[PDB]
Amino acid sequence: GSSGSSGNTAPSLTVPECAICLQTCVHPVSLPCKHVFCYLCVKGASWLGKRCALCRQEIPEDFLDSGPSSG
């Protein structure tokens, strides 16, 4: 069925910047706090632990870990 939908609806076709490493966001992830960061910088950065860097909005484990191992 329908499984796997990410923020596609975009006014342009480019990659935004990051507010954690200060460089092109390799993986722009729309956080529940209305922000964008590298899927890696959010999953676990050097100075980050399951929490935004701009607003520090607690991120739910489900955010990254969604759905059972096997579908």
What are the residues binding Zn ion (CB under 5 A)? Answer: 18, 20-21, 33, 35, 38, 41, 52, 54-55, 57
Helices (H) and strands (E) in the chain, counts: 2, 2
What residues form DSSP beta bridges with 28?
A: 38
By CB atoms closer than 10 A (0-12, 13-18, 19+), residue 42 is: buried
Minimum gap (Å) between residue 7 Cβ and Zn ion: 15
Report the residue number, 57 or 66, with the smaller CB distance to Zn ion: 57
Report the residue number, 29 or 70, with the smaller CB distance to Zn ion: 29
Minimum gap (Å) between residue 48 Cβ and Zn ion: 9
